[PDB]
Every structure is written in structure tokens, then in C-alpha cells.
């Protein structure tokens, strides 16, 4: 039902700073991304979610095959953080989508930067 109206200021972890973005051709998480991820993982485990799908993505620069594999590496970097936060390994699905599903305009630096991402998906 509508119990969310009882919520006060605690635990709002899915805001604008919770996107998981990567540098050009990078597949490693920077210190603050690791932090966000640990906090997302903690938030999820705090609401009894311990199962996740991680979908990696690239911008459209370069070869499609190379980008498919880069997108997998990005999702893998995210998976490792979920495992170290205590999420069971078998409950983490990893998937690379390469360049095929952009969220933003690849013709700008800012848009390509929004496309280099891992989307955390929480299944039923």
C-alpha cells in the first residue's frame, strides 16, 4: 500500500549522484564510484534485495566487438563490488550491451560520457 509517506530523510540512495559512469575506454571504478556502489549495495541489502542484473554499455566510438567486450568488463567491475559488499555471487547476473542501447546523444562529449555506464537492474 502507501507506506512510503511515512519515510522521513533517511536512506535516499538512488539520486542523481548514484549513476555508475566510466572514463573513455576505462573499465575500472574510481574511489567515489566504489563508495556509491557499496552504499547502493548496502541500501539494497537493507531492503532484503540480494539479486541484481548489471548491464554494461559503451558510447559508439570504435569497433563494435571491442565495445561489446569493454561493456562486459565494466559490468564485471561492478559485480566485484557487489560481491565484496556481501551480495551472493550466484545472484549477480552480468551482461554487456556494447554500443547498442545509448541513453544520451553520442554526438557530444557530455552525451558519450553519459553512455559509458553500467545500469543496475533489480529483478522481480
Amino acid at each position: 500500500q502507501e507506506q512510503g509517506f511515512e519515510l522521513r530523510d533517511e536512506g535516499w540512495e538512488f539520486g542523481m549522484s548514484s549513476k555508475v559512469l566510466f572514463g573513455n575506454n576505462l573499465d575500472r571504478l574510481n574511489p567515489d564510484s566504489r563508495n556509491t556502489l557499496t552504499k547502493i549495495a548496502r541500501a539494497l541489502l537493507a531492503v532484503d534485495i540480494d539479486k541484481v542484473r548489471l548491464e554494461g554499455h559503451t558510447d559508439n566510438y570504435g569497433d563494435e566487438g571491442y565495445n561489446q567486450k569493454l561493456s562486459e568488463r565494466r559490468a564485471e567491475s561492478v559485480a566485484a563490488v557487489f560481491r565484496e559488499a556481501g551480495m551472493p555471487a550466484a545472484n549477480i547476473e552480468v551482461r554487456g550491451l556494447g554500443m547498442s542501447k545509448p541513453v544520451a546523444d553520442n554526438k557530444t562529449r557530455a552525451g558519450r560520457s553519459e553512455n559509458r555506464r553500467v545500469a543496475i537492474i533489480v529483478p522481480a
Binding site: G4, M16, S18, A43, A46, K101, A119, I121, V122
Partner: protein, 149 residues
């Protein structure tokens, strides 16, 4: 094993559920819900609703190619549209503070924040945290307990 009316009422309930975990940076007096594209389970929504906090939810269908969806609604309930149509809709919404929920749950990789699975014994959903992060609205993690009830 479930009727169309049962499913539509269940969709109405889960949407009210989800809305209660959401905060808009500028809360309207009346929450504007837009039903966009072909739907099976929106007839209940379209009779209008009241939130448990007192706020009325005004529901209308709008066109997929309306360029102002992002300023005309707080919430979009997205029906079974093509890939071109889906791209059109999310281009219009980008940068506006909009809660997005899809009727069908096959494509939750990009676009909707929540994608419902309505066929079956209870409604469940998937949540895409990247879409939530880009939405401009605040969504509390405990919204995720609704998918398991």
C-alpha cells in the same frame, strides 16, 4: 486465473504504492499522470485516483509524439510502443522531473524506471537504477519491497 478488471485494479494499487516512495522537487497540488501509447491495464488509472496523503491524481491519455510530455506530467505510464516511439518519448522526457512506469517489462534496459509484469498471480516489477538516477525525482529504496508483496 486473473481477469482484466482484477489486473487493472492491481495496476492502480501498485502505482499508488510506488508514488508514495517518490518525491518531486516541486510537488504539485494535483499529480498529473499521462497514459501514453496502447494499454491494456490503464482503464482504472483513467478514472482518476486519490493518494493516501490527500492529493488527487488526474489521469489523461496523451500522444506519443506530444513534444511537451515532460512539462505536462509528473508521471508517465507507458504502453506497448515501438522502438522509434519509445525513443521519441524519452527524448521528450529527458531533463524533466518525471516518474516513468511501463506496462510491460520486456525492455527495462533503457527508458522506464519501473517495468511491470502484470500477467500472473501478483504484479511484480523490475527497477532500473540508472533510469531512476537520471529521472530528476527522488525514489526511496524501500519502494523495492512492493515487487515482493
Amino acid at each position: 486465473r486473473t481477469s482484466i478488471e482484477q489486473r487493472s485494479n492491481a495496476v492502480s494499487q501498485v502505482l499508488l504504492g510506488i508514488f508514495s516512495y517518490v518525491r518531486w522537487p516541486k510537488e504539485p497540488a494535483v499529480l498529473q499522470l499521462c497514459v501514453v501509447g496502447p494499454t491494456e491495464y490503464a482503464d482504472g488509472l483513467l478514472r482518476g485516483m486519490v493518494q493516501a496523503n490527500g492529493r488527487r491524481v488526474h489521469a489523461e491519455r496523451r500522444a506519443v509524439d506530444n513534444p511537451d510530455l515532460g512539462t505536462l506530467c509528473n508521471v508517465i505510464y507507458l504502453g506497448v510502443v515501438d522502438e522509434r516511439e519509445r525513443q521519441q518519448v524519452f527524448r521528450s522526457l529527458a531533463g524533466h522531473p518525471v516518474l516513468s512506469i511501463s506496462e510491460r517489462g520486456t525492455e527495462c534496459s533503457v527508458g522506464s524506471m519501473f517495468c511491470l509484469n502484470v500477467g500472473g498471480p501478483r504484479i511484480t516489477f523490475e527497477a532500473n537504477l540508472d533510469s531512476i538516477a537520471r529521472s530528476g525525482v527522488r525514489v526511496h529504496p524501500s519502494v523495492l519491497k512492493l515487487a515482493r508483496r
